[PDB]
Amino acid sequence: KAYRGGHLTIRLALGGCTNRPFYRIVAAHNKCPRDGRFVEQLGSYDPLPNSHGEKLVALNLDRIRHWIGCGAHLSKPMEKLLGLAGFFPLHPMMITNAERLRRKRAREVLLASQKT
């Protein structure tokens, strides 16, 4: 299909039922639907933690690189995933979130101390 110059994107996609989210990381057109067609499917990601606490992620890094070269952008979740992997740097947003969490924890601790 012909779109108005919609860029390429490496993006997640819901391949799950209700309450089981399963993800499909996928090189697709920006203006395509979420679960609609794509250019080339890449490494499936699972968010629900499987038997003995693993949250497994596939990645065809070799083809991801190619896609990047060809000029395909990355959604924020994808970027985060990459950072986690060690393929990209940690997305600064993630870092900030972590910091915030830490701060919150500290506050909680302080409150507890006050109480006691």
Partner RNA sequence: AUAGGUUUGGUCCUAGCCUUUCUAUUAGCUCUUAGUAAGAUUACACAUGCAAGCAUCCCCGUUCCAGUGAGUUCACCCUCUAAAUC
Residues in contact with another protein by the rule CB under 8 A: 15-20, 22, 24, 41-44, 46, 48-51, 53-63, 65-66, 68-71, 81, 83-92, 94-99, 101-103, 105-106, 109
Q: How far is the CB of 18 from Zn ion (least distance, A)?
A: 10
Window 1-30: residues binding Zn ion (CB under 5 A): 17
Structure token digits, residue 107: 């506050």
Q: How far is the CB of 33 from RNA (least distance, A)?
A: 3
> For 71-90, b where at least 16 C-beta lie within 10 A, e where not — what string?
ebebeeebbbbbbeeeeeee
Structure token digits, residue 65: 């690189």
What is d(CA 72, CA 38) in angstroms, rounded to the nearest whole number?
12
Residue number with CB closer to RNA (89 or 103): 89
Question: Roughly what angle, to the nearest 10 degrees, separates helices 76-85 and 92-115?
Answer: 80
In single-letter form, the type of residue at position 109 comes to: V
Binding site for RNA (CB under 7 A): 2-8, 17-19, 31-34, 36, 69-73
Q: How far is the CB of 39 from another protein (least distance, A)?
A: 13
Interface positions with Zn ion (CB under 5 A) = 17
